[PDB]
Design an enzyme around this catalytic site. Structure first.
Site, PDB file in Angstrom:
ATOM      1  N   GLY A 230       0.877  -0.998  -0.288  1.00 39.85           N
ATOM      2  CA  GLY A 230      -0.043  -0.073  -0.421  1.00 39.85           C
ATOM      3  C   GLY A 230       0.829   1.321   0.047  1.00 39.85           C
ATOM      4  O   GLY A 230       2.329   1.044  -0.119  1.00 39.85           O
TER       5      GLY A 230
ATOM      6  N   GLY B 297       3.045   1.073   3.398  1.00 37.51           N
ATOM      7  CA  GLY B 297       3.300   0.002   3.100  1.00 37.51           C
ATOM      8  C   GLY B 297       2.910  -1.646   3.332  1.00 37.51           C
ATOM      9  O   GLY B 297       1.959  -1.020   2.043  1.00 37.51           O
TER      10      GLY B 297
ATOM     11  N   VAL C 147       2.297  -5.932   3.878  1.00 32.32           N
ATOM     12  CA  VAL C 147       1.835  -6.549   4.782  1.00 32.32           C
ATOM     13  C   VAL C 147       2.354  -8.171   4.249  1.00 32.32           C
ATOM     14  O   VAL C 147       2.084  -8.342   3.496  1.00 32.32           O
ATOM     15  CB  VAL C 147       0.030  -7.167   4.876  1.00 32.32           C
ATOM     16  CG1 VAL C 147      -0.116  -8.189   5.986  1.00 32.32           C
ATOM     17  CG2 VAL C 147      -0.228  -5.445   5.290  1.00 32.32           C
TER      18      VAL C 147
ATOM     19  N   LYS D 248       3.013  -6.589   9.570  1.00 34.07           N
ATOM     20  CA  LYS D 248       2.757  -5.442   8.405  1.00 34.07           C
ATOM     21  C   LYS D 248       4.076  -3.805   9.036  1.00 34.07           C
ATOM     22  O   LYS D 248       4.426  -3.995   9.876  1.00 34.07           O
ATOM     23  CB  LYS D 248       1.733  -4.553   9.428  1.00 34.07           C
ATOM     24  CG  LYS D 248       1.084  -3.184   8.496  1.00 34.07           C
ATOM     25  CD  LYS D 248       0.254  -3.106   9.694  1.00 34.07           C
ATOM     26  CE  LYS D 248      -0.863  -1.975   8.961  1.00 34.07           C
ATOM     27  NZ  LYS D 248      -2.276  -1.733   9.622  1.00 34.07           N
TER      28      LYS D 248
ATOM     29  N   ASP E  88     -14.824   0.982  11.089  1.00 31.15           N
ATOM     30  CA  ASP E  88     -14.265   0.613   9.703  1.00 31.15           C
ATOM     31  C   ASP E  88     -15.399  -0.786   9.998  1.00 31.15           C
ATOM     32  O   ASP E  88     -14.624  -1.870   9.496  1.00 31.15           O
ATOM     33  CB  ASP E  88     -13.626   1.031   9.460  1.00 31.15           C
ATOM     34  CG  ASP E  88     -12.849   0.850   7.996  1.00 31.15           C
ATOM     35  OD1 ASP E  88     -13.500   1.411   7.925  1.00 31.15           O
ATOM     36  OD2 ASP E  88     -11.621   0.232   7.484  1.00 31.15           O
TER      37      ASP E  88
HETATM   38  C1  LIG Z   1      -3.628 -11.357  -3.758  1.00 31.47           C
HETATM   39  C2  LIG Z   1      -3.046 -12.543  -3.638  1.00 31.47           C
HETATM   40  N1  LIG Z   1      -4.013 -13.326  -2.098  1.00 31.47           N
HETATM   41  C3  LIG Z   1      -4.880 -13.923  -1.821  1.00 31.47           C
HETATM   42  C4  LIG Z   1      -5.651 -14.774  -2.347  1.00 31.47           C
HETATM   43  C5  LIG Z   1      -3.037 -12.333  -0.854  1.00 31.47           C
HETATM   44  C6  LIG Z   1      -3.834 -12.703   0.763  1.00 31.47           C
HETATM   45  O1  LIG Z   1      -4.255 -13.304   1.048  1.00 31.47           O
HETATM   46  C7  LIG Z   1      -4.073 -13.351   2.989  1.00 31.47           C
HETATM   47  C8  LIG Z   1      -3.701 -14.432   2.947  1.00 31.47           C
HETATM   48  C9  LIG Z   1      -3.979 -14.901   4.660  1.00 31.47           C
HETATM   49  C10 LIG Z   1      -4.113 -13.329   5.272  1.00 31.47           C
HETATM   50  N2  LIG Z   1      -3.535 -13.556   6.611  1.00 31.47           N
HETATM   51  C11 LIG Z   1      -3.561 -12.334   7.649  1.00 31.47           C
HETATM   52  N3  LIG Z   1      -3.568 -12.488   9.100  1.00 31.47           N
HETATM   53  C12 LIG Z   1      -3.716 -11.288   9.653  1.00 31.47           C
HETATM   54  C13 LIG Z   1      -3.655 -10.224   9.087  1.00 31.47           C
HETATM   55  C14 LIG Z   1      -3.501 -10.103   7.853  1.00 31.47           C
HETATM   56  N4  LIG Z   1      -3.652 -11.138   6.641  1.00 31.47           N
HETATM   57  N5  LIG Z   1      -3.901  -8.849   7.241  1.00 31.47           N
HETATM   58  C15 LIG Z   1      -3.379  -7.860   5.940  1.00 31.47           C
HETATM   59  C16 LIG Z   1      -3.304  -8.218   8.066  1.00 31.47           C
HETATM   60  O2  LIG Z   1      -3.239  -6.770   8.041  1.00 31.47           O
HETATM   61  N6  LIG Z   1      -3.042  -8.594   9.833  1.00 31.47           N
HETATM   62  C17 LIG Z   1      -2.217  -6.682   9.974  1.00 31.47           C
HETATM   63  C18 LIG Z   1      -3.330  -5.712  10.746  1.00 31.47           C
HETATM   64 CL1  LIG Z   1      -5.109  -6.024  10.306  1.00 31.47          CL
HETATM   65  C19 LIG Z   1      -3.252  -4.807  11.209  1.00 31.47           C
HETATM   66  C20 LIG Z   1      -2.151  -4.897  12.038  1.00 31.47           C
HETATM   67  C21 LIG Z   1      -0.519  -5.839  11.552  1.00 31.47           C
HETATM   68  C22 LIG Z   1      -0.950  -6.814  10.761  1.00 31.47           C
HETATM   69 CL2  LIG Z   1       0.253  -7.686   9.914  1.00 31.47          CL
HETATM   70  C23 LIG Z   1      -3.599  -9.401   9.621  1.00 31.47           C
HETATM   71  C24 LIG Z   1      -4.017 -11.756   4.376  1.00 31.47           C
HETATM   72  C25 LIG Z   1      -4.324 -12.147   3.087  1.00 31.47           C
END
Ligand SMILES: CCN(CC)CCOc1ccc(Nc2ncc3c(n2)N(C)C(=O)N(c2c(Cl)cccc2Cl)C3)cc1
EC number: 2.7.10.2
Length: 271
Positions: A24, A27, A29, A43, A134
């Site tokens: 983004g 930054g 993830v 992140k 949100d």
């Molecule tokens: C483009 C292709 N696509 C697959 C089809 C890829 C994406 O697919 C996935 C697969 C698994 C995940 N798993 C996931 N788990 C926990 C968090 C997270 N993703 N994200 C995106 C955050 O920003 N986190 C977070 C938050 Cl919410 C706040 C602060 C820090 C973090 Cl790390 C918590 C996320 C996305």
């Protein structure tokens, strides 16, 4: 509390970034590994993209709010690049997931289950005097056992008394946002209830955008007439009527999240 004194601070070498999940303005993830064996989400702040204080405010928030139904803070690297490390949700976003071959085969029974889980997590937040601000399918994460957790607390706020007033210069998704928060900038747990209502249509339609065929202005315009969103297709009327309690005109007439959970759990165990 100083980093050398902080229980969440970890050495950046305990981490191993493996796969980018998204990038983004501010930054990226990543999926990675902590101390070899534990899968985490990471992140990272783009130096310059924004304030380290602003970035970290979210992680600090997550130090307070912990719950099985909220995404769990693991740790921070509070030196640049700055990292926030959370537990990893395998199925990712609810909105994406519902469009997959797997989510598409999901029974209404399971969907109502998922909706009660999200309401339950909001109940905890409700009682802790927070608002999320949100709430929508994009900000709900799905584990490998098909359970749901609330994520993304960048906009979340503690409420000293009653409500939160936004600043002159903040915008929100017009289609998920309660009228009063659009017109007066005033947010309460009760306008999170409005959003939960839009989120439910977002669930039962397997991800489709609320208010099909309508621009933001049209949507605003129809709500003022007393109209609410047209019944989504294949939406049980029991469910549609619950969404309608969430879209009550007066905030204080909208139900509590614990009520919502009760009703949804009755629906779920019924089917
Ligand atoms: C483009 C292709 N696509 C697959 C089809 C890829 C994406 O697919 C996935 C697969 C698994 C995940 N798993 C996931 N788990 C926990 C968090 C997270 N993703 N994200 C995106 C955050 O920003 N986190 C977070 C938050 Cl919410 C706040 C602060 C820090 C973090 Cl790390 C918590 C996320 C996305």
């Amino acid at each position: 509390k100083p980093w050398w004194e902080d229980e969440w601070e970890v050495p950046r070498e305990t981490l191993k970034l493996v796969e980018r999940l998204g990038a983004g303005q501010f930054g990226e993830v990543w999926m990675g590994y902590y101390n070899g064996h534990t899968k985490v989400a990471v992140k990272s702040l783009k130096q310059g993209s924004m304030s380290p204080d602003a970035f970290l405010a979210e992680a600090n928030l997550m130090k307070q709010l912990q719950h099985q139904r909220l995404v769990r803070l693991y740790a921070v690297v509070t030196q640049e690049p700055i990292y926030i490390i959370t537990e990893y949700m395998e199925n990712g976003s609810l909105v994406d997931f519902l469009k997959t071959p797997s989510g598409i085969k999901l029974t209404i029974n399971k969907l109502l289950d998922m909706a009660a889980q999200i309401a339950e997590g909001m109940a905890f937040i409700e009682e802790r005097n927070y608002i999320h601000r949100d709430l929508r399918a994009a900000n709900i994460l799905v584990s490998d056992t098909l359970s749901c957790k609330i994520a993304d607390f960048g906009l979340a706020r503690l409420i000293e008394d009653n409500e939160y007033t936004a600043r002159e210069g903040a915008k929100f998704p017009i289609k998920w946002t309660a009228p009063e928060a659009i017109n007066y900038g005033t947010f309460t747990i009760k306008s999170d209830v409005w959003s939960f209502g839009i989120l439910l249509t977002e669930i039962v339609t397997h991800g489709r955008i609320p208010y099909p065929g309508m621009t933001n202005p049209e949507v605003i315009q129809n709500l003022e007439r007393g109209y609410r969103m047209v019944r989504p297709d294949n939406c049980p009327e029991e469910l549609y009527q619950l969404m309608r309690l969430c879209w009550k005109e007066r905030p204080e007439d909208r139900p509590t999240f614990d009520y919502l959970r009760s009703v949804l759990e009755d629906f779920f165990t019924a089917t």
